Amino acid sequence: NQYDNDVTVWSPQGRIHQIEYAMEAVKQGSATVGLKSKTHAVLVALKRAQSELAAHQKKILHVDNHIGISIAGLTADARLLCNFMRQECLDSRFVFDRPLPVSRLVSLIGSKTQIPTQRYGRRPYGVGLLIAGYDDMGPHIFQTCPSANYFDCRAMSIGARSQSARTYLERHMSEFMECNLNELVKHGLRALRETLPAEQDLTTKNVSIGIVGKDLEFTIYDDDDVSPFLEGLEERPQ
Amino acid sequence: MEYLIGIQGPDYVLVASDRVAASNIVQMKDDHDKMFKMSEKILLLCVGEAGDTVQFAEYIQKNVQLYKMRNGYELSPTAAANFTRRNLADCLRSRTPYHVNLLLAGYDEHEGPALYYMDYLAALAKAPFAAHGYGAFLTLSILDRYYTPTISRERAVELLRKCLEELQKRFILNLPTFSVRIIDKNGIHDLDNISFPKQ
Amino acid sequence: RFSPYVFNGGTILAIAGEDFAIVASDTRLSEGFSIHTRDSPKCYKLTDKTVIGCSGFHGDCLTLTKIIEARLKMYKHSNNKAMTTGAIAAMLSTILYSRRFFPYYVYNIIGGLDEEGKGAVYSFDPVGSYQRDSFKAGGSASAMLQPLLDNQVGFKNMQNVEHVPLSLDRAMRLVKDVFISAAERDVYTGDALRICIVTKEGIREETVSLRKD
Amino acid sequence: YDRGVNTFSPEGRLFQVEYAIEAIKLGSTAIGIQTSEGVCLAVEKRITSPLMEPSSIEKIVEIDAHIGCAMSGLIADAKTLIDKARVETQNHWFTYNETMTVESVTQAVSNLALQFGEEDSRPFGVALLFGGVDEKGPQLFHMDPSGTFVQCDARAIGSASEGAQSSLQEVYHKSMTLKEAIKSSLIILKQVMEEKLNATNIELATVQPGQNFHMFTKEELEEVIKDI
Amino acid sequence: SIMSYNGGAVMAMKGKNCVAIAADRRFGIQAQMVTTDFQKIFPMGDRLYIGLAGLATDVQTVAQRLKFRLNLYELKEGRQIKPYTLMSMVANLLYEKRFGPYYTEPVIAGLDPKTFKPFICSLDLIGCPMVTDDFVVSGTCAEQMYGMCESLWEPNMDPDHLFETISQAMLNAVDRDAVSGMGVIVHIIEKDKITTRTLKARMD
Amino acid sequence: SYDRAITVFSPDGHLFQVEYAQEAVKKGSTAVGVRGRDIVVLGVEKKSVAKLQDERTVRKICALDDNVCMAFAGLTADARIVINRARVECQSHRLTVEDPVTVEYITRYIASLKQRYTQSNGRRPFGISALIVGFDFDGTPRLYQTDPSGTYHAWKANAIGRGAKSVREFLEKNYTDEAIETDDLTIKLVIKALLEVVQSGGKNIELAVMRRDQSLKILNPEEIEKYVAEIEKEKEENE
Amino acid sequence: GYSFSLTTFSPSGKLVQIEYALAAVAGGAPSVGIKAANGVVLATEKKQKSILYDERSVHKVEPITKHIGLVYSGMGPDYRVLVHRARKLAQQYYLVYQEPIPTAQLVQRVASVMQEYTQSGGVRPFGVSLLICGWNEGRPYLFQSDPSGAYFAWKATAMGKNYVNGKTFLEKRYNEDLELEDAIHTAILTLKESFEGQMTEDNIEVGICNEAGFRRLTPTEVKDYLAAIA
Amino acid sequence: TTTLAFKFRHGVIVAADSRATAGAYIASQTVKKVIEINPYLLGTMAGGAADCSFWERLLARQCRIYELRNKERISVAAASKLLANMVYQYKGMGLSMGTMICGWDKRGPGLYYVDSEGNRISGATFSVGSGSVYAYGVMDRGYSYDLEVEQAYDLARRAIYQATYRDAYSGGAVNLYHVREDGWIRVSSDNVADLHEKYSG
Amino acid sequence: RYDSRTTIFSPEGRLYQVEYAMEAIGHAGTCLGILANDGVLLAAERRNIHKLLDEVFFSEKIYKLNEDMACSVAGITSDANVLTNELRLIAQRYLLQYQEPIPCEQLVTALCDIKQAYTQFGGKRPFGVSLLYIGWDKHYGFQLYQSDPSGNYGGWKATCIGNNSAAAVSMLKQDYKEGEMTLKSALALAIKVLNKTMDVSKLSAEKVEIATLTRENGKTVIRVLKQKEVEQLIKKHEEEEAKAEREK
């Protein structure tokens, strides 16, 4: 067990346990689910609080006019990668005068996060990004990892107890592709309502929904365009 | 432009500045002071580019105060003069050169009184009496006519009266009022301000 | 030798209204004794309440426009709100002083609404000073336009003529007449006019042509 | 083990940040309550000696003309953070002719509340309460050593914060008034303190939109004390 | 010139078993003198002098810098310095400012540390050494001192005739010179003692 | 978690070397300082003259300016470096804004330097605690103290070194309202502090004064003998 | 398990990673050097491991200038590094002063180099003790240094295996006043005292230092001399 | 361009014009030259606009930081000193800046004069600009120490009127500020043509 | 327990390496300087008195540093070279800057700061060397100082080296002198101190070393004196031993 201390040290089984400990640090974040249609990409996260009087910590934060991210894990590394993300947006926005393809941006994220996973002196980043964008070929939902093995999907979910969400994605990934925005969003919260224990209900103040469309700019919502999205639901089948 | 005169005596140093701070046409300040009290027996006068005079005041004045508060005793006039000459010679060869004209007045327990003489090319000198500007010339003629190493302080003051009477007669400049110090075994004593109604 | 500057010209007008900001400019881009194009609007819409025009050296106009847009996005994406007009004015002034020892050879006018909903024109200079005025004329046609605006807007040098506040449509007719009168005599002026109007409901644009010589 | 900032836990977590959160606890308490009339705020001084001059120990400092602060933990990390905020606020007014709003103040502080790094130093040991009035009325803001900043309506910190939050949630609702919240706060203060409450123990800091200047109460606080 | 800003004249002349160095006393700006007691001949150890002429600032700074490196050398090694060692050191000190040059013409005059062997050399403003046997000169006036020393020098000279020869040469060449004058200092050294005399020059 | 290093916390939220570096001060020589209304005065104990050398070099009370006065505890070398830096800081401040240097700014400098010196990587913190006495703003007497953590902390009287609790406890029972000025009573107050010192040997007492306008004055071991004589006279009059 | 490494003292004693470097020096090849009245003679003991090796490749007696000899007793790869350092440094002296550098000044600067390498804490010190000699200003010198950065001055000394026995013989046999040839004789004697006996023109390697300069002798004159020199 | 400043018993008078041209072309007539530094400090704009604006804004920044670090209002000589030490770092690089520094002090009134040439001096009367010598003449006609308030107001108003009358580079609205012991106050902003009608006869 | 580096503290608050540097000092050469006006002296013990040396250096512990100052030394010998070159460079920088000899106290504090910067910083070996100071100035005359690896420095009139000199300091206190500036008296006193404190039977002159510093008319010369006067000093002190055994 004396070899399970640092990033540089290979294990005698070859598995860097620093990476898996970073994975387990990621797994203690909030629940969030990302899923796309052919035309609309929606990522929905869950808020939490310190106390009743306290506000709720936001998860979905704005990045760019066609890029917005979810997050789970650390907050300092989150805002650090947020600053790097905005910088990488506006740099090519300045140079090429175009919006970025998403794939090369997330490759830049992986190359950014590789060096703190190989050298000594900086820990790997506990990070839970779900990235929604629009290049010329439509919406993309990418997910990240502290091992910088970024994954492209059609529907993912990370955080605590996100497995029921993943099974819901399994049983509706055939159905996600054709529908319009409204029932797509209520499919998203019909993953988030199974990311919870059933003895309480998903309220207004704990959720946020972000839609970016092929003609729609990325926009975050909180309780107010969400109370329209919170209607149109049934109870859980108790 | 103007000039501040610095006569050496037997046991005193008779320095005398002006009070003029004109700007190319008009006299902005008619009660100016160029006298920089370094320590209890060491003075300094400064004439040059008026952006650099304040900077030398800061640097030399405060660093000699720093030596005094560090070690515990007051500098010799010679070491302070060499410190100034070394700093001008070092700051000469840079992207920011310094162009002033200094002259140093100090007093030792051992060496007694002392006069030094600078340049804008950073030269030490141990002179009886110095010069800068054009008051340079007009003082040096009479002052080398009537110098005696064994002169009394009242004869030196009288000589300065006479020379100033000759200065107010053949210049282009105005130069109304001259402020005067003296250094002794005690320290810096300011004499009365020396002005003249002309006609 | 290589010279770093060239005079492209331009003509920028601004009027601070009661609740409006009108900025208009011709679209001729010329150089020396030739015409590069007859379509290049010097006016640019920053927010819903802010329009900037930039004349002078064209490359610095483009570069400054891009940097200003970048810092607009920086402020909004940091602080969840758009800028006011005078904040943009202070920011542009700090930039123009930040390249003091190699200046932008660019005249600048920011027009827009304040937080009270009234017109506010901030003039500029190539080194970066500014002030809140009612009307300015920027470019080669500055002197051809300023005394007439002193006549009409300021009502200056007149006797027994009371002060009526400037309406919208009267100001539109003013802008059309001043650009016709300046295009008759200036050589850096003509072929078009890009008129932008800032209201409390958005930005209106309007293109009025001119003579083709 | 856990020995340094560059090593996770098998379950989480730092394990340096945790010991910083533990190092919150040693400090004296402080209570701020957001009211739409304005933000009230309080603190305990914990004076040791009569030679210890009471107005010299700073707890409420002034960052902006409408922004207060309160510190909880190591004094000098807090002094560094106050210094940086005092710089940065002035730069925001410089570059924008306006007041940096308090949430943006806290984002600027929490940018390097965790920039802790010894190569490529330690994380800071203070939690901070920010009270101010932006365009949206008054704001009360609560950060931590870990930079996880959130808004709080009435936050209590430091030692005996548990029963303070308990009796605070006992008494709080959304539509409180000013002096009622003031006396409600100082009741909780004299319930959590060990000494007799007087003019030297506590100090208040009241900011209002119409009373932006002077976020302080000086010896009228005596009159507020004697009304209980 | 820049060399003719403060004036200057340094003469060294090698005798039979001794060596003599002399310089002027005048210091001042281009035409306005200041004082008559400016040192240009500096003692560098025993029985080994140096002469400096040209810009007075470079003179004093180079003299103090050479004093610095000289004391460090003689305290790293307890023996005193040989004159060729001094010549190479001075040439190195000048050549460090190859493109930032000081404005001076150093003249080294000293004896042998072991024997009584005399020595003269002079250098340029970039560090070009030159050893001769008769005399070296430097400063603003040159051709006067060249003519006088080529006129009056003999190879084997008793110290009295060496003294009087360098005396007459310096006095006539300084009286022909304009920007350098106002008295002459003379150092005549030998193995036994060091003699320093000041001459009654024309103060015009 | 351990006494090494300075960088990591305890599991219950402490810094060991911050807490431990104060012990070097707490085992150090005692030096007190009070403020009068017009004349401020202080002094160190344990001159400890070892019979064969001079003691003008071991002076623990100095000045940075003509308006501020020093004292310290702990080890002497850190005090040497901190004061040598603080002189240059005072003079650089004088090279800036032309006021006499306020005591508050230079205490913020010294404590700030000490703290950002502590925060860095493996630098042993200065185990001293200075006493910084001055009267600048219309002769308002001020004295602040420092800490190895670097916290300036304004007092009215002060006592550090060995047995500082008892020595400060004497000032609790001594420091009534009508101390000063009454400069003579401030003089007798310093004398009673020196008599209440941990050894109070009578000749190992070294005290220095400032009348808020003059210079630092080192007293003479005959005036202090008269002060001990009149203090013993007051003790006999108590009988 | 202490000292470890170079940054701390012992609880009471000295520096263990200097003492072990001296131990590795003492576990080195034997050598001897004798200061005579007119010259200084250096000589080593160089046995090849097999009969395969060549004796015109690596050279123990090494000049630093035309008048300075220098040998060692230790590890060759470090020996070459510090020799190359001394070469460059002596050339810097000859650049500055235009004069051949005195051996005391070499010892000052080489000792400063070695002491700089003993400074904490990332490199090891040398496993090299030196023997520096030369005929500077008539009087020849002989300077032995060590990995600790210090130095000495000897009349005659030795370094390597059985250096105590060679030192007792040099105390016994040698004296103050000899010639170069007599010093050569007693140097080969004290080298053959502790070496193996099969000693030819190749197992030893001798350099001398005349007042005419340094001289590194050849196997021709070696076999002319050492063919049963006593 | 013409500014002036003179202190007396009841504080400091600060007045200036508002004309800032562009060579032979007038840019504006309403350039507020007297830059409001603080509620207790007032600087002017004298030759070059960007340098005056920028470096006085940086001075206001540094004064605010000084006050928030020392809980204490800064002195006037302090401000002139910091401004000269900031501006002197670009000597020879071509900055034109000739402002004045005014404010109330613990010593009382405060009047300093800071150039881009670094000519930091105090004094009693100053006047900066192209037509400054006109103002020197009329002010040193009308100067005393024991003037009244309305006397000083009409004095400075007369002064700026004369300066803008003879010089061509001066005009616009005549601003007029007044420093007190507690805080400065704008007195008036008078146009030249009104003053010509009022004072011409 | 809390050993590893020089920095940081052991919990008392005490130190590790300053104490261990003094215990490194104690096993080294013994030196002393005496109370003298119109001159001052230094004594030193010859380490490594083996017969195959050369002694062509004339100085093994003494280093005539600027003009009017020498310094004895004790401890790790190469660090003494490292510090003495730098100290000569400091003094020569002062002379370069002011053209005045260094008045020795700021010189001492400068070297103490050089040592102290390695005491605080990490991880560096602090100089395990104490060394003496003799010198003359314009302000106090003949002076004596004691450098320490802590950076503390003591102005003494009769100095102290380690375990071989604690008894020397005891004899210096019990046989304290004051008022006599006669150098031969203090030299006999130092001869007595090295006679008792060194274990050299009958005090052979090859095991001793004496350097003095007198003020001569403007020059302040430093006298590294030779062997024959040391021989007659030994005979003088042994005649004083015969005077001591006159009581038998």
CA G59/CA G76 separation, integer angstroms: 10
Q: Show the CA angle centred on residue F152, arms to residues F215 and D23, nearest 5°.
A: 165
Alpha-carbon separation of residue B165 from B130, B175, D221 (angstroms): 19, 12, 72
Alpha-carbon separation of residue A96 from A90, A133, B32, G8 (angstroms): 10, 18, 61, 58
Q: Which residues are paired to G133 by β-bridges?
A: G69, G142
Residue among H70, H74, H85 minimizing CB distance to F104: H70
Nearest to G229 by CA among G170, G173, G188: G188
Nearest to I99 by CA among C56, G100, B85: B85
Does an H or E element contain F62, and which? none
What is the SS3 string spanning chain A? CCCCCCCCCCCCCCCCHHHHHHHHHHCCCCCEEEEECCCEEEEEEECEECCCCECEECCCEECCCCCEEECCCCCHHHHHHHHHHHHHHHHHHHHCCCCCCHHHHHHHHHHHHHHHHCCCCCCCCCCCCEEEEEECCEEEEEECCCCCCCEEECEEEECCCCHHHHHHHHHHCCCCCCCCHHHHHHHHHHHHCCCCCCCCCCCCCCEEEEEEECCCCCEEECCCCCHHHHCCCCCCCC
Interface test with C, best of A79, A90, A91 (most C CBs within 10 A): A90
CA F144/CA F106 separation, integer angstroms: 10
CA E92/CA E101 separation, integer angstroms: 12
Q: Which chain C residue has its CA at the smallest distance from D134's CA?
A: C79
Instruction: Name the architecture of domain F1-239.
Output: 4-Layer Sandwich (3.60)
CA H170/CA G182 separation, integer angstroms: 105
CA I75/CA I83 separation, integer angstroms: 12
Which residues lie below 8 Å from residue F13, measured CB to CB, with a gap of 6+?
A: D19, D20, D22, D23, D24, D25, D26, D125
Contact, I53 vs G155, CB < 8 A?
yes
Give how many domains chain A has, as a whole number: 1
- Tell me the chain E residues in contact with residue G109 when contact means C-beta distances shorter than 8 Å: none
Chains G and H touch (3+ CB pairs under 8 A): no
Q: Would strands H121-122 and D67-73 be described as parallel, antiparallel, or unpaired? A: unpaired
Q: Where are the alpha helices (DSSP H) in chain D?
A: 17-22, 75-96, 102-110, 161-171, 178-192, 221-225
Chains E and B touch (3+ CB pairs under 8 A): yes
Q: Is D3 close to F8, i.e. CB distance below 8 A?
A: yes
Burial (0-12, 13-18, 19+ Cβ within 10 Å), C110: buried
Minimum distance, in Å, between the CA of residue E114 and any CA atom of chain G? 12
In what side-by-side order are the strands of the sheet with G40-45?
A: G156-159, G31-35, G40-45, G204-210, G213-216
CA F52/CA E86 separation, integer angstroms: 47
b/e code A112-133 from CB counts within 10 Å (16+ = b): bbeebbeeeebbbbbbbbbbbb
Q: Show the CA angle centred on residue D129, arms to residues D123 and D135, nearest 5°.
A: 125
| CATH number where E28 lies | 3.60.20.10
- Structural domain boundaries, residue H120: 1-201
CA E138/CA E142 separation, integer angstroms: 6
Minimum distance, in Å, between the CA of residue H69 and any CA atom of chain F? 8
Domains of chain D, first to last: 1-228 (3.60.20.10)
CA I112/CA I130 separation, integer angstroms: 10
Nearest to I67 by CA among I225, I210, I215: I215
Which residues lie below 8 Å from residue B36, measured CB to CB, with a gap of 6+?
A: B43, B44, B45, B46, B57, B60, B61
Q: Name the experimental technique.
A: cryo-EM
CA A189/CA A197 separation, integer angstroms: 14
Q: Which residues of H are catalytic?
A: 1
Question: What amino acid is encoded at H60 in this protein?
Answer: A
Contact, F72 vs F130, CB < 8 A?
yes
DSSP structural state of residue H90: G
Largest alpha-carbon pair distance within chain E?
48
Contact, D199 vs D67, CB < 8 A?
no
Q: Which residue has the tokens 């009796």?
A: D167
| CATH number where C161 lies | 3.60.20.10
- Tell me the chain C residues in contact with residue D101 when contact means C-beta distances shorter than 8 Å: 79
Contact, I68 vs E71, CB < 8 A?
no
Contact, F111 vs F125, CB < 8 A?
no
Domain ranges of chain I: 1-248
Give how many domains chain C has, as a whole number: 1
Task: Please spell the DSSP secondary structure of chain C, one letter per residue.
Answer: ---S------EEEEEE-SS-EEEEE---EEETTEEEES----EEEEETTEEEEEEESHHHHHHHHHHHHHHHHHHHHHHSS---HHHHHHHHHHHHHHTTTS---EEEEEEEE-SSS-EEEEE--SS---EEESEEEEETTSTTTHHHHHHHTS-TT-SS---PPP-HHHHHHHHHHHHHHHHHH-SS--S--EEEEE-SS-EEEEE------
- CATH topology assigned to domain I1-248: Glutamine Phosphoribosylpyrophosphate, subunit 1, domain 1 (3.60.20)
H49 is in an annotated binding site: yes
Structure tokens at B196: 């003249």
CA G9 remoteness from chain centre = 29
Residues recorded for chain D? 228
Structure tokens at G92: 């810097």
Q: Which chain B residue has its CA at the smallest distance from I109's CA?
A: B71
CA G121/CA G3 separation, integer angstroms: 11
Helix, strand, coil % in chain B, rounded to nearest 5: 30, 20, 45
Task: Please spell the DSSP secondary structure of H41-62, one letter per residue.
Answer: EEE---S-HHHHHHHHHHHHHH
Chains C and D touch (3+ CB pairs under 8 A): yes
Contact, C121 vs C151, CB < 8 A?
no
Q: Is F105 close to H70, i.e. CB distance below 8 A?
A: yes
Alpha-carbon separation of residue F21 from D78, F30, F74 (angstroms): 21, 17, 9
Nearest to A90 by CA among C72, F121, B169, H53: C72
Contact, H109 vs H11, CB < 8 A?
yes
Residues recorded for chain A? 238
Touching I: which chains, 3+ CB pairs < 8 A?
A: B, E, F, G
Interface of B with I (CB under 8 A): 70-71, 73, 76, 78-79, 82-83, 86, 110
Contact, D69 vs D41, CB < 8 A?
no
CA A32/CA B14 separation, integer angstroms: 88
What is the SS3 string spanning chain G? CCCCCCCCCCCCCCCHHHHHHHHHHHCCCCEEEEECCCCEEEEEECCCCCCCCCCCCCCCCEEEECCEEEEEEECHHHHHHHHHHHHHHHHHHHHHHCCCCCHHHHHHHHHHHHHHHHCCCCCCCCCEEEEEEEECCCCEEEEEECCCCCECCECEEEECCCHHHHHHHHHHCCCCCCCHHHHHHHHHHHHHHHCCCCCCCCCEEEEEEECCEEEECCHHHHHHHCCCCC
Minimum distance, in Å, between the CA of residue C97 and any CA atom of chain H? 7
- Structural domain boundaries, residue A216: 1-238
Burial (0-12, 13-18, 19+ Cβ within 10 Å), F211: middle
Does residue D86 belong to the interface with chain H, where contact is any CB pair within 8 Å? yes
Does residue A204 belong to the interface with chain D, where contact is any CB pair within 8 Å? no
Classify F170 as helix, strand or coil: helix
Which residues lie below 8 Å from residue D47, measured CB to CB, with a gap of 6+?
A: D54, D57, D200, D201
Taking the CA atoms of F168, F174, F179 and F182 in sequence, report the sign of the dihedral they define: negative
- Tell me the chain E residues in contact with residue G112 when contact means C-beta distances shorter than 8 Å: none
G121: preceding bond cis by omega (within 30 degrees): yes
Superfamily (CATH H level) for G1-230: Aminohydrolase, N-terminal nucleophile (Ntn) domain (3.60.20.10)
Alpha-carbon separation of residue E128 from A21, C198, E12, E42, E81 (angstroms): 72, 78, 17, 21, 20
- Tell me the chain A residues in contact with residue C70 when contact means C-beta distances shorter than 8 Å: 90, 93-94
Does residue E36 belong to the interface with chain B, where contact is any CB pair within 8 Å? no
Burial (0-12, 13-18, 19+ Cβ within 10 Å), I52: middle
Contact, A130 vs A72, CB < 8 A?
no
| CATH number where A95 lies | 3.60.20.10
- Tell me the chain I residues in contact with residue B86 when contact means C-beta distances shorter than 8 Å: 97
Burial (0-12, 13-18, 19+ Cβ within 10 Å), H67: middle
Minimum distance, in Å, between the CA of residue G14 and any CA atom of chain I? 7
